[PDB]
Amino acid sequence: PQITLWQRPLVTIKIGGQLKEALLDTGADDTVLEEMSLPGRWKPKMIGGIGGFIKVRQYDQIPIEICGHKAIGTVLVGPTPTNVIGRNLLTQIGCTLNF
Amino acid sequence: PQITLWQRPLVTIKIGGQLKEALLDTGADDTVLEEMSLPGRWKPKMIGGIGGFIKVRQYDQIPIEICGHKAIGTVLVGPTPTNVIGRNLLTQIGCTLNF
Ligand SMILES: COC(=O)N[C@H](C(=O)NN(CCC[C@@]1(Cc2ccccc2)C(=O)N([C@H]2c3ccccc3C[C@H]2O)C[C@H]1O)Cc1ccc(-c2ccncc2)cc1)C(C)(C)C
């Protein structure tokens, strides 16, 4: 579908069998999610945002649906006011910018 | 044209008689640029991104040339580690997300 930007591009995602609201963010290299439970082991990562750096838990090869589109990739769990879907997953669903 | 997201969507804009590189960011409500001078009135505010909040100066009705388009919008000026073009300006050039 085509999503205009007059409002925040919030969509529904599904991860771990649960539905959550997330923001499609072309300015993010990675996908950052609010605290939640994920399987397996995690690795450390330090990411930088507009306000500074934060530590997150990196989980790999995690199944996740975005607007009904299936993806499997890396998700980072840490302190954020909203779930952010970055380019690592936007490319998996074939998302592009157009004008 | 169509912009894929395999790489960061960087563009060159013209503002205040200056040329700056900026990231097309669908997650940003408004454009945020590193310290620079802008004419007109402004009001201070705090924006909270990943890593915490930063203080910025909000300028409205600022002329900006982007992707061959002469648009007008709001610009937040402050200590951001990266320049980003937000929805406030992206809408004016008819930019949309598609997948
Ligand atoms: C390479 O790094 C990244 O891609 N980082 C991601 C990120 O923040 N990307 N920024 C781009 C994305 C910004 C949003 C992320 C967001 C955060 C919380 C809740 C919802 C959305 C951000 O900070 N936003 C805030 C914003 C902006 C304008 C006006 C108001 C407000 C309030 C917030 O919503 C919205 C997005 O634009 C650009 C950027 C690139 C490099 C460095 C860096 C580089 C090197 N050293 C230091 C900093 C700092 C910033 C992230 C999400 C993975 C942390």
Q: Tell me whether residues A96 and B3 touch, CB distance under 8 A.
A: yes
- C-beta atoms of B27 and A24 within 8 A: yes
- Residue A93 CB neighbours (<10 A): 17
- CATH number of the domain residue A96 falls in: 2.40.70.10
Does residue A71 contact residue B75 with C-beta atoms inside 8 Å? no
Q: Please give the distance, rounded to the nearest whole angstrom, from the Cα atom of residue A25 to the centre of ligand 1.
A: 9
Count of other CB atoms within 10 angstroms of residue A82: 15
Q: Among residues A25, A29, A30, A60, which one is catalytic? A: A25
User: Which atom of ligand 1 is nearest to B31's Cα?
Assistant: 28
The alpha carbon of B21 and the centre of ligand 1 are apart by a number of angstroms equal to: 16
The sign one gets for the Cα dihedral B66, B70, B73, B78 is: positive
Q: How many domains does chain A have?
A: 1
Q: What is the resolution of this structure in A?
A: 1.5
Q: Which residues contact A27 (CB under 8 A, 6 or more apart)?
A: B8, B9, B23, B24, B25, B26, B27, B28, B82, B84
Experimental method: X-ray
Residue A59 and residue A74 in contact, taking contact as beta carbons nearer than 8 Å: yes
Domain span at A9: 1-99
